[PDB]
RNA sequence: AAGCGUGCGUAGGCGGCUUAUUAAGUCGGAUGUGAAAUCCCCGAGCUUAACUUGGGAAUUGCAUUCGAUACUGGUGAGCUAGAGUAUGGGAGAGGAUGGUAGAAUUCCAGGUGUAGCGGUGAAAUGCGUAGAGAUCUGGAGGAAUACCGAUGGCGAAGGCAGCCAUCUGGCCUAAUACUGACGCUGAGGUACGAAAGCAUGGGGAGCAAACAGGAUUAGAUACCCUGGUAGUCCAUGCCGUAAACGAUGUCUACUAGCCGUUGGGGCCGGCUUUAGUGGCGCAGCUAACGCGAUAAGUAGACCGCCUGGGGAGUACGGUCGCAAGACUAAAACUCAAAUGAAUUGACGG
């Protein structure tokens, strides 16, 4: 059934970028919003919205395209439910030699790889984005 | 704005042969036929006409290529009255890619037409010249609109981006700029200036051609 | 080369959303320890180099202790998008049991009637003057259900077709209500699983392995013809295999369109929406062929399986079986290929 939801969101965004959609909606969640805010701060998406219907929330992402091709060229789930990643502050991965980002979950929140390296911590690697 | 409204640039092909890549440039579909919205269609026809005018003002050419067997008369009509190269019968695969080879036929026509009523060809048989006249007619009905071109055109104007796909691919290869009047049943794949509107109507094709020509006359 | 024949489920793996808490995983610090040598880096002595040697770095570990709580886990509390339940309808060769119908074949008795029938490429074997074949009447019996009939339907798969009753399974579909993550997948294990075969007892019309005869043929243990027994059918059990195939494991989400068809819902013959089942085709994917919302695309969860060809799915051991066999499953030896898809020719009874 549906078990990984972070990967399901990443897959929705990837597939909507492949089909030149301008917006992608999905069922919202606290962690999904926390990852969408990081994708927006790094300039990878345009806008993030969360609409409460009555009890089920819906997240809506606005996508960016730069000269035809999409901005998110590659997005990859790294820590699956079947295998979690858990890097340390020294082994934090770099994506495309620092031209891409790595979403990390640390006890200080969800951040990018270089933010966690600056803060001298690092926990679960969620996704590579470029 | 309203001149294309009374022209039938709105009505199009039936709502079963649409290309899904034109759903932005459509408005609705009444009576089982998609109707193009002319509002945002005019704002791009004007840009295409400005591009054609500024291209004719910097001393460049533009090939009018239309051969759908319906607007093949109006294309020659509104082009030869505008001093520009024409394509009326067949898109002649390899006109731009193998332009050097077709030069060897444009020169055969520049020699054959001059060998009919320009060099006073006399002292010959009446039936022997019929074969050479057939050669010249077969060559002219195919290339008589590109004789005064002499080089690769700088722009192109097509009446059916769908029916003239070989020409659009040759342009997208040779790095030329294309302009097309793309209807509902057509792909806007490599048209540099897409102009949504009818590609088969009499008055609409005549309007597109006459407007392009009147923009060419800005010289 | 490689998806178990198909399900169900045990251990296990993995699991929706919100919130409080914890701090096990995870992260950070500190403190012990992680022998020296070796490796690495600076530099020091051998005329240089090997070599010797000072100091570090490293030893990514483990333990203790303190801190951080995003994520995973635990615990409490909630929620309703997954899963399920109740209530009205609908389609259906779903299954099991028992009746019944009509056509036809075969055989039997009688009537008419007389010389062929039958069969083939051509024949012959064969059946006929004891009366065949043809035709009519009556009867007996077994097996299968023309037309409808349909890339139709139902079923987990194997499969399922006249009609009727009885017992029974699932699915679809509309509303309202309810429960509140009750889920997905599953090694072992179990259930079902074509045909052929096997056991016990029946039945036996047609067809027909084996077999017999006639042909053909160089031969003909065949193909063709005339017969024909097991078997095919029923009851009750075994067997457990198939090109058991979509050669495509199950579940979930997402990604242009167009054209059919089956079962429903909605709205005005048409439009839409669902559950199936088909034909194309964008993107993407692919060695290519192709696939393309019924993916072989994009991702995730669990499982099964592959690792050159042969020897070999064989031996030996074991489990199961009445047996036939099935299942699990090697090695020596041997070869430098075997293979897929496409291309250009040539050939084709
Ligand atoms: Mg194979
Ligand atoms: Mg299978
Ligand atoms: Mg369990
Ligand atoms: Mg668990
Ligand atoms: Mg801890
Ligand atoms: Mg040491
Ligand atoms: Mg709970
Ligand atoms: Mg019956
Ligand atoms: Mg409740
Ligand atoms: Mg299961
Ligand atoms: Mg098993
Ligand atoms: Mg026989
Ligand atoms: Mg098998
Ligand atoms: Mg198989
Ligand atoms: Mg359908
Ligand atoms: Mg329907
Ligand atoms: Mg297809
Ligand atoms: Mg798939
Ligand atoms: Mg493949
Ligand atoms: Mg064996």
Coordinates of C-alpha atoms in Angstrom, one line a residue, chain B residues 5-218:
Chain B
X5 CA -13.7 37.6 -35.8
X6 CA -15.6 38.0 -39.1
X7 CA -13.0 35.9 -40.8
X8 CA -13.6 32.5 -39.1
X9 CA -10.2 32.3 -37.4
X10 CA -12.2 31.1 -34.4
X11 CA -13.8 27.9 -35.8
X12 CA -11.5 25.0 -36.3
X13 CA -11.3 21.2 -36.6
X14 CA -13.7 18.9 -34.8
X15 CA -13.2 18.0 -31.1
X16 CA -11.7 14.6 -31.8
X17 CA -8.6 15.5 -33.9
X18 CA -7.2 18.2 -31.6
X19 CA -3.6 18.1 -30.5
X20 CA -3.5 18.2 -26.7
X21 CA -0.6 20.6 -26.9
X22 CA -2.9 23.4 -28.0
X23 CA -5.3 23.4 -25.0
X24 CA -4.0 26.8 -23.8
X25 CA -4.8 28.5 -27.1
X26 CA -8.4 27.2 -27.1
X27 CA -11.4 28.6 -25.4
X28 CA -14.2 26.1 -25.7
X29 CA -15.8 23.7 -28.2
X30 CA -19.4 24.3 -29.4
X31 CA -21.2 21.9 -31.8
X32 CA -18.4 19.3 -31.5
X33 CA -15.8 21.6 -32.9
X34 CA -13.1 23.5 -30.9
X35 CA -13.2 27.2 -31.3
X36 CA -9.9 29.1 -30.9
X37 CA -10.0 32.2 -28.8
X38 CA -9.0 35.1 -31.1
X39 CA -8.3 37.5 -28.2
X40 CA -4.8 36.3 -27.3
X41 CA -4.4 35.1 -30.9
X42 CA -4.3 38.7 -32.3
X43 CA -1.6 39.7 -29.8
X44 CA 0.8 37.2 -31.3
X45 CA -0.2 37.7 -35.0
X46 CA 0.8 41.4 -34.4
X47 CA 4.2 40.3 -33.0
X48 CA 4.8 38.0 -36.0
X49 CA 3.9 40.8 -38.4
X50 CA 6.3 43.1 -36.5
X51 CA 9.0 40.5 -36.8
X52 CA 8.4 40.0 -40.5
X53 CA 8.4 43.8 -41.1
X54 CA 11.7 44.4 -39.2
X55 CA 13.2 41.4 -41.1
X56 CA 12.2 42.9 -44.4
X57 CA 13.5 46.3 -43.3
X58 CA 17.0 45.0 -42.6
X59 CA 17.2 43.6 -46.2
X60 CA 16.3 40.0 -45.6
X61 CA 13.9 37.5 -47.3
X62 CA 11.0 35.4 -46.1
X63 CA 9.7 32.2 -47.8
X64 CA 5.9 32.0 -48.1
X65 CA 5.4 28.2 -48.1
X66 CA 1.8 26.9 -48.3
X67 CA 0.7 23.9 -50.3
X68 CA -2.5 22.6 -48.7
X69 CA -4.2 22.5 -52.2
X70 CA -6.7 25.1 -51.0
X71 CA -4.6 28.2 -50.0
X72 CA -2.1 27.3 -52.7
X73 CA -3.7 29.9 -55.0
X74 CA -3.9 32.8 -52.5
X75 CA -0.3 32.1 -51.3
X76 CA 1.1 32.8 -54.8
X77 CA -1.3 35.6 -55.3
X78 CA -0.4 37.5 -52.1
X79 CA 3.3 36.7 -52.4
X80 CA 4.1 37.6 -56.0
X81 CA 2.4 40.9 -55.1
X82 CA 4.9 41.3 -52.3
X83 CA 8.3 40.5 -53.9
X84 CA 9.2 37.4 -51.9
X85 CA 9.9 33.7 -52.6
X86 CA 7.0 31.3 -52.8
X87 CA 6.3 27.6 -52.4
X88 CA 3.0 26.6 -53.9
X89 CA 2.9 22.9 -55.1
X90 CA 5.2 20.7 -53.0
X91 CA 7.4 21.2 -50.0
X92 CA 10.2 19.4 -52.0
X93 CA 11.9 17.5 -49.2
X94 CA 15.5 18.7 -48.8
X95 CA 15.0 22.2 -50.2
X96 CA 17.0 23.8 -47.3
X97 CA 19.1 20.8 -46.2
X98 CA 20.2 20.0 -49.8
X99 CA 20.0 23.5 -51.1
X100 CA 23.2 23.1 -53.0
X101 CA 21.7 20.2 -55.1
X102 CA 18.5 22.2 -55.8
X103 CA 20.7 25.0 -56.9
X104 CA 21.6 22.7 -59.9
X105 CA 17.9 22.8 -60.8
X106 CA 17.3 26.5 -60.1
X107 CA 20.1 27.1 -62.6
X108 CA 18.5 24.7 -65.1
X109 CA 15.3 26.8 -64.9
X110 CA 17.3 30.0 -65.1
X111 CA 18.7 28.5 -68.3
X112 CA 15.5 27.0 -69.7
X113 CA 13.3 30.0 -69.3
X114 CA 16.0 32.2 -70.9
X115 CA 16.1 29.6 -73.7
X116 CA 12.4 30.1 -74.5
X117 CA 11.6 33.8 -74.9
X118 CA 14.9 35.5 -74.1
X119 CA 17.4 34.1 -76.5
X120 CA 15.2 33.9 -79.7
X121 CA 15.6 30.1 -80.1
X122 CA 14.8 29.6 -83.8
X123 CA 15.9 27.2 -86.6
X124 CA 14.5 24.1 -84.9
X125 CA 11.6 21.7 -85.1
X126 CA 8.2 22.4 -83.6
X127 CA 7.8 19.0 -82.0
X128 CA 11.4 18.7 -80.8
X129 CA 11.0 21.7 -78.4
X130 CA 7.9 20.2 -76.8
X131 CA 10.1 17.9 -74.6
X132 CA 12.2 20.8 -73.4
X133 CA 9.0 22.8 -72.8
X134 CA 7.7 19.9 -70.7
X135 CA 11.0 19.9 -68.8
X136 CA 10.7 23.6 -68.1
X137 CA 7.1 23.3 -67.1
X138 CA 7.8 20.4 -64.7
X139 CA 10.7 22.4 -63.3
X140 CA 8.8 25.7 -63.0
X141 CA 5.6 24.3 -61.4
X142 CA 8.0 23.0 -58.7
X143 CA 10.6 25.8 -58.3
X144 CA 9.4 28.9 -60.2
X145 CA 8.7 30.6 -56.8
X146 CA 12.2 30.1 -55.5
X147 CA 14.1 31.2 -58.6
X148 CA 14.7 34.7 -57.3
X149 CA 16.0 33.6 -53.9
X150 CA 19.7 32.9 -54.5
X151 CA 20.2 32.0 -50.8
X152 CA 18.8 30.5 -47.7
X153 CA 15.7 32.5 -46.6
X154 CA 15.8 34.3 -43.3
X155 CA 12.2 33.6 -42.3
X156 CA 9.4 31.3 -43.2
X157 CA 5.6 31.6 -43.2
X158 CA 3.5 28.5 -43.3
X159 CA -0.3 28.0 -43.6
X160 CA -0.3 24.5 -42.1
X161 CA 2.4 23.6 -39.6
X162 CA 0.9 20.1 -39.7
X163 CA 0.7 19.6 -43.5
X164 CA 4.1 21.2 -43.9
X165 CA 6.1 19.3 -41.3
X166 CA 9.0 18.5 -43.6
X167 CA 9.6 22.3 -44.1
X168 CA 9.3 23.0 -40.4
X169 CA 11.8 20.3 -39.6
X170 CA 14.2 21.5 -42.3
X171 CA 13.9 25.0 -40.7
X172 CA 14.4 23.7 -37.2
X173 CA 17.5 22.0 -38.5
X174 CA 19.0 24.9 -40.5
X175 CA 18.5 27.3 -37.6
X176 CA 16.0 29.5 -39.5
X177 CA 13.1 31.3 -37.9
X178 CA 9.6 29.9 -38.6
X179 CA 6.2 31.5 -38.4
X180 CA 3.0 29.5 -38.8
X181 CA -0.7 29.7 -38.5
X182 CA -1.4 26.7 -36.3
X183 CA -4.9 25.4 -36.0
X184 CA -6.5 23.0 -33.4
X185 CA -5.3 19.9 -35.2
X186 CA -1.6 20.8 -35.2
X187 CA 1.5 20.7 -33.1
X188 CA 3.2 24.0 -32.0
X189 CA 6.4 22.0 -31.7
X190 CA 9.0 24.2 -33.5
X191 CA 7.0 27.3 -34.6
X192 CA 9.0 30.3 -33.3
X193 CA 5.9 32.5 -33.7
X194 CA 2.8 30.4 -33.2
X195 CA -0.3 32.1 -34.5
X196 CA -3.5 30.2 -33.5
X197 CA -6.2 30.4 -36.1
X198 CA -7.9 28.7 -39.0
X199 CA -5.6 27.0 -41.5
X200 CA -8.2 26.0 -44.1
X201 CA -10.7 28.9 -44.5
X202 CA -10.7 31.0 -47.6
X203 CA -11.1 34.4 -46.1
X204 CA -8.9 33.6 -43.0
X205 CA -6.0 32.3 -45.1
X206 CA -6.4 35.3 -47.4
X207 CA -6.3 37.6 -44.4
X208 CA -3.2 36.0 -42.9
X209 CA -1.4 36.2 -46.2
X210 CA -2.5 39.8 -47.1
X211 CA -1.5 41.0 -43.6
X212 CA 1.9 39.4 -43.8
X213 CA 2.4 41.0 -47.3
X214 CA 1.2 44.4 -46.2
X215 CA 3.7 44.1 -43.3
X216 CA 6.4 43.1 -45.9
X217 CA 5.7 46.3 -47.8
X218 CA 7.0 48.4 -44.8

